[PDB]
């Protein structure tokens, strides 16, 4: 009979409770105080303009119909009580396919404080949409947003707020760093009003600032393209009479330049404009053709030539001048 005390409390709270109506329907505005604990920021898929994020989506509001007087102040209740009470219909504005985890029980909790303050946290994975601007690929920064708010309740019915200070209302766990390509720098939050045909809704916006690490693309694209240009420019060090030998340098370097041009263009989506990596490839695609038509010049005029004695110095020079000015205008933005 020791648990009949707590049984009679919960049967009394739900007696006459209407869970289809928000608390304070005709009196005030239901302030829902929220904060996010990010257990792991998942990988950003740049092909699909999306990122995954695992949150502990905490919410808290006030309900005056759930007041109780008992032996304990807080009621760390089971999960199935949360479906028998009013909970806010917070959806994500830019979510795409986001899953609430169900193993083994539903991963939600509900705590009811004795004055009527409620806490209701959910464990979610959110496959949100991050519109990114790939002009400075791969030396680019992105601010992937996560916008959430009410669905059916306007700004005169349910308003949102942060629990702690807005600097301390989105926390990222230290061990959760599932990004392999990008680099999370920090998070900034905001609040505002959106306009719809049904009404005005309070939106809650947070941004996750990411900077892409270029260490993968140096050893995949930037160094094999540099080594191809040097492989094209060693052809000036040969003799004029080796016509089949120098055209092996001419053909195979431009044939491996156009494979990297493609092998590299498949990473990022079908982009209409040209990225900053495509400006490095196209200039390097011009240096191998500038070496190939240099050989066709000296083969048509076939002692040592003044063309090869000038292209042995100018071609490593003008490639170095471009290489100095390309990185300095992009790494220091």
């Amino acid at each position: 009979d020791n648990t009949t005390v707590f049984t009679r409390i919960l049967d009394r709270l739900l007696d006459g409770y209407d869970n289809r109506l928000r608390p304070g329907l005709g009196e005030r505005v239901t302030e829902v105080k929220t904060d996010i604990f990010v257990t792991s920021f998942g990988p950003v898929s740049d092909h699909d303009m999306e990122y995954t994020i695992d949150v502990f989506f905490r919410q808290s509001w006030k309900d005056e119909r759930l007041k109780f007087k008992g032996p304990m102040t807080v009621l760390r209740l089971n999960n199935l009580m949360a479906s028998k009470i009013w909970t806010p219909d917070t959806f994500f504005h830019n979510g795409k396919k986001s899953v609430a985890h169900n193993m083994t029980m539903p991963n939600k909790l509900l705590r009811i404080t004795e004055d009527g303050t409620l806490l209701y946290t959910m464990r979610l994975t959110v496959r949100a949409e991050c519109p990114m601007h790939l002009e400075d690929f791969p030396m680019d920064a992105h601010a992937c947003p996560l916008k959430f708010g009410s669905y059916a309740y306007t700004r005169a019915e349910v308003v949102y707020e942060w629990t702690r200070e807005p600097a301390r209302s989105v926390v990222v766990a230290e061990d959760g760093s599932r990004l392999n390509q990008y680099d999370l720098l920090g998070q900034t939050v905001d609040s505002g009003i959106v306009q719809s045909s049904t009404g005005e809704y309070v939106v809650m916006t947070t941004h996750f600032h990411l900077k892409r690490k270029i260490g993968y693309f140096v050893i995949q694209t930037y160094l094999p393209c540099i080594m191809t240009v040097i492989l094209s420019q060693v052809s000036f060090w040969l003799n004029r009479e080796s016509v089949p030998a120098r055209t092996v340098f001419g053909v195979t370097t431009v044939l491996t330049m156009t494979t990297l041009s493609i092998s590299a263009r498949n990473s990022l989506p079908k982009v209409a404009y040209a990225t900053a990596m495509d400006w490095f490839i196209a200039v390097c695609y011009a240096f191998v053709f500038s070496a190939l038509i240099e050989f066709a010049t000296v083969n048509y005029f076939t002692s040592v030539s003044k063309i090869d004695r000038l292209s042995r110095i100018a071609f490593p020079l003008l490639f170095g001048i471009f290489n100095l000015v390309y990185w300095a205008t992009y790494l220091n933005r």
């Epitope: 006030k62 004055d115 303050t117 308003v159 707020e161 942060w162 200070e165 807005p166 600097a167 900034t188 939050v189 905001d190 609040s191 505002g192």
Partner: antibody, heavy 117, light 106 residues
Framework: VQLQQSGAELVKPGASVKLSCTAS????????MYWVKQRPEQGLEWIGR????????KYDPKFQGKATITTDTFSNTAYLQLSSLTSEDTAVYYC???????????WGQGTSVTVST | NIVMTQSPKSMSMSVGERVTLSCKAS??????VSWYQQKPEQSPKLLIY???NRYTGVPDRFTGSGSATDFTLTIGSVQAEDLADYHC????????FGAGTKLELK
């Protein structure tokens, strides 16, 4: 609605002072309590905040070890505590609460401290 | 820590014209930038909670504009009851305030 503070006091330097801010029309357990230092002909200066639900208190880095706040739920009043006050801290103390967008909507009438002879 | 600078320190204008306040933060404060007036030997009150969101009871001549860093308070027509200096605050972190901006009437 109505925010009330106690009247002004005269204190000697090196002594301790007690200052109160009584809230009426609303309970303290849901909204934060903000206290702010207003020097004469100068701007405002926040000194500390109070979360009365769990008793959490976070101070300004300048005023660490200078101010202390206790808050009684039954008395509907929060208390100042200035232990090592000097003669430079001659100002008026205002009471505030967290508003709609973390603003300070309701303010007290303000109590001015005076440290002289 | 966050610092707020209000420019200029003071100004002197008459009744019924345009004034533009200025308030710039050290780093990003999103929208939680509050404007407070201080009538002499009274208590402060609230003008704009958040950015560009008027409080209840203040006249419609007061308006603001919000951004990431810079925030302005604009009064279309200065009246005879606005004898107060205006303080620009912030709330994205632990709150801090500017030095205020005094004004006077001819």
């Amino acid at each position: 609605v109505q925010l009330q503070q106690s009247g002004a006091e005269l204190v000697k330097p090196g002594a301790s002072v007690k200052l109160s801010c009584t809230a009426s029309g609303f309970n303290i357990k849901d909204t934060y309590m903000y206290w702010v230092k207003q020097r004469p002909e100068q701007g405002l200066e926040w000194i500390g905040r109070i979360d009365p639900a769990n008793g959490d208190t976070k101070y300004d880095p300048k005023f660490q070890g200078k101010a202390t706040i206790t808050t009684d739920t039954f008395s509907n009043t929060a208390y100042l505590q200035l232990s090592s006050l000097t003669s430079e801290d001659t100002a008026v103390y205002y009471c505030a609460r967290k508003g709609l967008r973390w603003a300070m909507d309701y303010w007290g009438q303000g109590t001015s401290v005076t440290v002289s002879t | 820590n966050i610092v707020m600078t209000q420019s200029p320190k003071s100004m002197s204008m008459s009744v019924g014209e345009r004034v533009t306040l200025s308030c710039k933060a050290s780093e990003y404060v999103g929208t939680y930038v509050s404007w407070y007036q201080q009538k002499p030997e009274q208590s402060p009150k609230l003008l704009i909670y958040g950015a560009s969101n008027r409080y209840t009871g203040v006249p419609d001549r007061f308006t603001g504009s919000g951004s990431a860093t810079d925030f302005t308070l604009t009064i279309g027509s200065v009246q005879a009851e606005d004898l107060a200096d205006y303080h620009c605050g912030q709330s994205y972190s632990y709150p801090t305030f500017g030095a205020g901006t005094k004004l006077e009437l001819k």
